[PDB]
């Protein structure tokens, strides 16, 4: 991946933590069944004001060694290509070629 595209994910990860608690209580109000009808309205309008990059749904898992946005595997944090290279070098504990 391009350098710029890699730096876009570190920003989105930082902004998702700085506004983490401030985002959760706003949705507590909006999802609150027995709140009122105008603070709900205010909480809805206030959630749109936070930067978009603060929502965790804006993040895209990337290969931690190349930046590849496809073929990701969460257990290793790597794309399918780098998982294979490390597995054959014996750099992933317990991981071997399977056969049953």
């Amino acid at each position: 991946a391009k350098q710029s595209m890699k730096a876009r994910e570190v920003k989105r990860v930082a902004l998702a933590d700085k506004y983490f608690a401030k985002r959760a209580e706003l949705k507590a109000i909006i999802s609150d069944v027995n709140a009122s009808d105008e603070d709900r309205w205010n909480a809805v309008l206030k959630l749109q004001t936070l930067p978009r990059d603060s929502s965790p749904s804006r993040q895209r898992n990337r290969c931690r060694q190349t930046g590849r946005p496809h073929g990701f595997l969460r257990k290793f944090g790597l794309s399918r290509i780098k998982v294979r290279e490390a597995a054959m070098r014996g750099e992933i504990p317990g991981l071997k070629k399977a056969s049953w």
Binding site: R64, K75, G90, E91, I92, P93, G94
Partner: peptide, 20 residues
């Protein structure tokens, strides 16, 4: 193997990246 530790899913990816 060239790496011989144990971890759950919670830190398996973070151990691999620090070994790298």
């Amino acid at each position: 193997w060239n790496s011989t530790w144990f971890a759950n899913t919670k830190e398996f990816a973070d151990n691999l990246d620090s070994d790298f």
